[PDB]
Amino acid sequence: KVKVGIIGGSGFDDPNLFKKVGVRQVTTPFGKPSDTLVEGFVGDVACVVLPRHGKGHLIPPSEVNYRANVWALKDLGCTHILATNACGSLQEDLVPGDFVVLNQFMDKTWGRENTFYGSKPDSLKGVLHMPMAEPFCERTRQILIQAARNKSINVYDKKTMDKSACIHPCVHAEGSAVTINGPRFSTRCESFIHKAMGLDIVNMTLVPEVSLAREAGLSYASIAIVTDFDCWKSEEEHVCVDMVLEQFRKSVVHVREILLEAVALIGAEDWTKTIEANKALVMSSRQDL
Amino acid sequence: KVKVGIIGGSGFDDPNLFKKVGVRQVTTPFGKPSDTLVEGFVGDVACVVLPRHGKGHLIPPSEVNYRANVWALKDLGCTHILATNACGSLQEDLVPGDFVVLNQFMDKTWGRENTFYGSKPDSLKGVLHMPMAEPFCERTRQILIQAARNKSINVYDKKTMDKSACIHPCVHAEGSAVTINGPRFSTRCESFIHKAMGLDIVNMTLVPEVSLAREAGLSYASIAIVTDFDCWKSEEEHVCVDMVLEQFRKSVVHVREILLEAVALIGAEDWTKTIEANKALVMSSRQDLL
Amino acid sequence: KVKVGIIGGSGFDDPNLFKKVGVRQVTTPFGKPSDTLVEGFVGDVACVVLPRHGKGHLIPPSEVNYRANVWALKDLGCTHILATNACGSLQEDLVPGDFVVLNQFMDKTWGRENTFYGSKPDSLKGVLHMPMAEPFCERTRQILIQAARNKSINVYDKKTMDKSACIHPCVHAEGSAVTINGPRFSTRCESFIHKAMGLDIVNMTLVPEVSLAREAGLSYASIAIVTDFDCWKSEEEHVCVDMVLEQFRKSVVHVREILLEAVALIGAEDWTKTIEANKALVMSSRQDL
Ligand SMILES: Nc1ncnc2[nH]cnc12
Ligand SMILES: Nc1ncnc2[nH]cnc12
Ligand SMILES: Nc1ncnc2[nH]cnc12
């Protein structure tokens, strides 16, 4: 029994992926979600849509209640979460218009509530140390990639394909993301430092959303939308809000295609053991037990 | 017309740049500034002076209300902000006594209020994503450098001069700064890591002051005072409070000379377009309005 | 007169080093310590034991009241603190079972109270900028190392020895630690990034414990217990709670042996000048004065 939650970020404040059947305003032990949750179906698969920054985009990346958002989806019966993340490219072969199915990240966030467990009154009791070597649900990752293939969107795998075979616009089959706290964009100094470390893209919204999803025993995968080259290139042109929004509008049609096709693909498989494994991993990470 | 705000940090708790014409204690949407603001004139140019840590230096770098300080300067009508920052050198050619007109930074601060905008009652409403590729006002940067030339202080530009032209004490025409949260100084491990990343100096007070200045639509430039070699050199001697204060007292006369001349140079030019551009950049970065 | 406090972390919530002669529950100007402080003797040397995470390990690394723990030990009259820290290795020469007498660290923590001094009501008045070039008490470090020698445990000093002399299990005479906030473990991306920076181990509990100890004028030394290779090696296996606890159980007998000998060796020497130097360093770091 699968149900897919969808979290839309920058340039995707109103995903609008289906005819809305119902609307839930929920509360969690960790506070209220960013907005009301919109429910509907993709085929026979139940689906929930939630704007990360609220309908009017009034909530900045660092102030988003990631716990409430993830836990609200969990309470509504979601087994999977597909998320969108606008980003800047730190590499030549990743160009505006491309998408990246992330498989790795580096965390530079702070001051965000990043765990459901702890000793404070507003947390679940216990100490939870989750393994995060491969922080995403690999099965869900491959579904996003396969969804791109089915909708005739180019896929580039750096490990099996030459760079001359990278056909833009394309969905990159892997990549690492540095997550900064924001709300400001990076300096040129920080950009080149991130490049030197071999990172692929830079964003503000991936962490702790990906971490909390695993804590919730949910299968999570991110589709990163490349909207710019950050600021490591020429003055014409470095990243700004207008640039991010402009490119995202150009790419949003392919984003909806991939997501809708992904939800259908997830509902076409059995996830019994994977869900078992997701829950068992959480229990085995409790050190207080 | 222009009005230049001046913020003094470590070793500069009492700038004393002029005779006070007025004295102001203001409230701000983000709290109280570090201390009373001092109003006056440098020649015919209006100025406002504000110590970053208070006159008694009781407020540590991580607890300074950068929001209130910058916003207070904005409300009083400041168009520019000149700021001083004590720092340790991570490079051979930057030695104690030198100064750096920074052009870049890397942020390693945390737990500081770094933006005026958000969804909390403690902030203005909206979501602001400012560009920070070149985080300083370039025109104001060049004025600091020119001010040093006018006061017969050596100026070293690594991009146009050979290393032989690096004569100390000198003002470096460019440089990057890593801003650590403090209050402790860095370990040797951290020092060499910052050094390997290619950073020029390390400080505790630059960020988020520079970021907030741009958010407020102000032209901001920093002059960093190199007081030590951090701790990547010999045990005699590694950075400590006494070392920092000792060098800063030796360097404070050149600092005041540069600032006063810079204020005069600012008042000699027209800034209508730059100020317009600064303000328009704010509104164009409001994603909630877009 | 010396008094050695011992802070036990992961895999060492119950050090059990001596017969309980007394117990203190205290309230400190910065709040309550993690647990009751147990008092006794190692030979003729006064000793105090305090579990960093509480007896039931209910307090996560980021929520530990390091200020209260250190200050409570200071108020009992402790002159020294010996601490244990579970960690993952980032380098080939450091394998599970090895111990490391740390001499350096890189801080990547956030949201932790890392100083006793400030302008907030819950802090001591003043501005304290402590030198931290070599953050540990060197005399106390050498005692930990000598304690290992006394117990016929291999000691590997990479500065005076060859790579062929690195015989496992061994106590490394030096090492650098990156301290992450947790509670999650690192991603492979982060693991390789830390590795490329030349760091030896990764942990969650060293900072700000070491920093506050120096602020309090106490001699502090950490012995790190390598329980895994983090996640930069083979998929079978990467770090998890079960792996950490399993290896620590295999090492705990030797950890206790070293600590007991260390406490005795401390009490056998005169620390009058060192103690004065510890106090003087704090006073010289007050910028407000
Ligand atoms: N360059 C960038 N940095 C951070 N977040 C972004 N979102 C889109 N582009 C971005
Ligand atoms: N080495 C240093 N690190 C941080 N802040 C400083 N201020 C002066 N010297 C410094
Ligand atoms: N790999 C690891 N990372 C962080 N803390 C740890 N404690 C034990 N192993 C660890």
Residue numbers in the entry:
A (entry chain B), C (entry chain A): 3 to 291
B (entry chain C): 3 to 292
Sentences from the paper on this structure:
Because the S. mansoni genome does not codify an adenosine phosphorylase, one alternative to fulfilling this activity is 5´-deoxy-5´-methylthioadenosine phosphorylase (E.C. 2.4.2.28) (MTAP). This enzyme catalyzes the reversible phosphorolysis of 5´-deoxy-5´-methylthioadenosine (MTA) to free adenine and 5´-deoxy-5´-methythioribose-1-phosphate (MTR1P). The observed overall fold of SmMTAP is similar to that of members from NP-1 family of low-molecular weight purine nucleoside phosphorylases (PNP), which consist of a central β-sheet distorted barrel surrounded by α-helices, as observed in other MTAPs from human and bacteria. Furthermore, a comparison of the KM levels reveals that S. mansoni MTAP can use adenosine with the same efficiency as MTA, which is one fundamental difference between S. mansoni and its host and reveals a potential target for schistosomiasis drug development.
With the exception of one orthorhombic structure (P212121) (in more than 100 datasets collected), SmMTAP crystallized in the monoclinic space group P21 with one or two trimers to an asymmetric unit. The Base Binding Sites (BBS) of two of the six SmMTAP-adenine complexes obtained (SmMTAP P212121 and S12T mutant) were fully occupied by adenine. In some structures, adenine does not bind in all subunits; the only WT structure whose BBS are all occupied is the orthorhombic SmMTAP adenine complex. The adenine molecule or adenine moiety of MTA forms three H-bonds within residues D230 (2) and D232 (1) and one H-bond with a water molecule, which is anchored by the side chain of residues D232 and S118. The orthorhombic SmMTAP-adenine complex does not present sulphate/phosphate molecules in PBS and shows a different conformation for the phosphate loop S12; in this structure, S12 OG interacts with Q289 NE2 via the H-bond (2.88A). It is interesting to note that S12 and Q289 are two sequence substitutions compared to human MTAP. The S12 OG also interacts with glycerol O2 via a weak H-bond.
